Amino acid sequence: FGYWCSPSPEQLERLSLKQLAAVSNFVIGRRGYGCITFQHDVDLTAFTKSFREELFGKIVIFRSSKTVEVYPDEATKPMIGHGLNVPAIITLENVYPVPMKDTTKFAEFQVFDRKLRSMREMNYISYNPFGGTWTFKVNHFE
């Protein structure tokens, strides 16, 4: 449903269980919603059933509320440093002040932007009011 990743599901299928434990350069997104770029190797061994069915909208969910969750079921969530529970850079699209998409009210965007910048757990990287594109870094998804 717009979900994609790199290496692609069909590529991940070629990896041994040992390789799968340390997938480099893993990226997962949803077109129109955003993207997660992992900063470290990720262990995808839990998802060998079907990378596509496990990852796309179950383990990783980009929602219409302009948010993303990784491991939304607390039973599926490994410790920090394991699985996908590792540092990542995230871009979310169409993120706007309250839903106030009017760029002519620039002062209001500046208030919102300062709120984004003050976030403790979603460490600000950038925010572009023309499109509502918010980029930030997380240390994990606990």
From Swiss-Prot:
Changing residue 140 to P: Loss of autocatalytic cleavage. Residues 2-140 are annotated as: Nucleoporin RNA-binding motif (NRM). Residues 1-141 form the Peptidase S59 domain. It is a peripheral membrane protein. This is Nucleoporin NUP145N. It is found in: Nucleus, Nuclear pore complex; Nucleus membrane. Transmembrane segments: none annotated.
